[PDB]
Amino acid sequence: VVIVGKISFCPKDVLGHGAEGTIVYRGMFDNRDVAVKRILPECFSFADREVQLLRESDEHPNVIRYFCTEKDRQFQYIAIELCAATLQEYVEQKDFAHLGLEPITLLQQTTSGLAHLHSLNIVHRDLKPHNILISMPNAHGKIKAMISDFGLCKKLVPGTEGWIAPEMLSPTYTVDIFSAGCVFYYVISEGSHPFGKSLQRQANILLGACSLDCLHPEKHEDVIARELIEKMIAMDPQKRPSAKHVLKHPFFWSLEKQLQFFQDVSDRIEKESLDGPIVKQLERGGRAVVKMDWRENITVPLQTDLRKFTYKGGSVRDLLRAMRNKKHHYRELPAEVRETLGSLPDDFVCYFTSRFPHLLAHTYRAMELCSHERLFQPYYFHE
């Protein structure tokens, strides 16, 4: 039972082995079970200024706490919040086993805690499933996720092979957005990686061989995620969105927010002269996005109801107008129409996004021109 004041741990409790002889044990900092990580000061150097700066500010729940740091002759000891497992176990675990923590909100917690570091000009520099940790259930048993191992520098490239941004091997906050983008695909894909093989993933990162198979081209849910992930893992770091940019993405929106975006967009475009820059950018994509005539791809009850009062059919703007029209007037529509559409907001928005998978992603990119406006502030980062 080793004791280095104030930290207390016992061997044979080892939670896991790290890199460069790093070992983590189950131990107790004060009255409370903690995870004690033993590192070799010749290998890893602990950053005291970064840990202190984080401790002196408001603590983010999705960033892990470093309780104490103690040194003995041979080693350097660090105490961190004892956790149940890592993100790998979460992904490998069965869907029912997640204990109420959903994958999207998990990625949100990760990205939020990552933005909290970046707000302090702290770059994690190693981000990966093992450094994303799953908390132990609290009381009632709710669990969160916490990014961990930040503020550890390898003495003489930082990070773990396969999660390292290409420019580091070829640092600012965009290194973490790259690793996050790989983690994002890892969680969604249920274990797959943007670069498939473990041995050649880092090699593929350097030459940009990334491939996303698990995201279907025809599925709205997957098209939204695809557009977000590919920007994060983009080879050119200046094209990668910030942490707060990611949190505003449609990937994190609820269904009513998705429908609310479609409504708020239609009102702005109303209100826009055709050939104008906003409407021209919106109508650029499709054509294909709207599936030629969209009136052909919607159920017959809606087709007939639309015969009353002229919709283009090759226009995304007209399609957005029709969706806003049926939502505001939903109570007025015949029970045949309301049956094939609602309930609202959920089954209603899914009616259009399922039939037009690129509609939300397409509309979102075209409408970035309004990102600065006060009405679209919920949908975009105003900077």
Ligand SMILES: Nc1ncnc2c1ncn2[C@@H]1O[C@H](COP(=O)(O)OP(=O)(O)O)[C@@H](O)[C@H]1O
């Ligand atoms: N706070 C913690 N609570 C429980 N287990 C942990 C904690 N931190 C790390 N571990 C375990 O230690 C192992 C290695 O950790 P670490 O030394 O950070 O190397 P790695 O980069 O592989 O995570 C992981 O597989 C993980 O299961």
Ligand SMILES: [Mg+2]
């Ligand atoms: Mg770790």
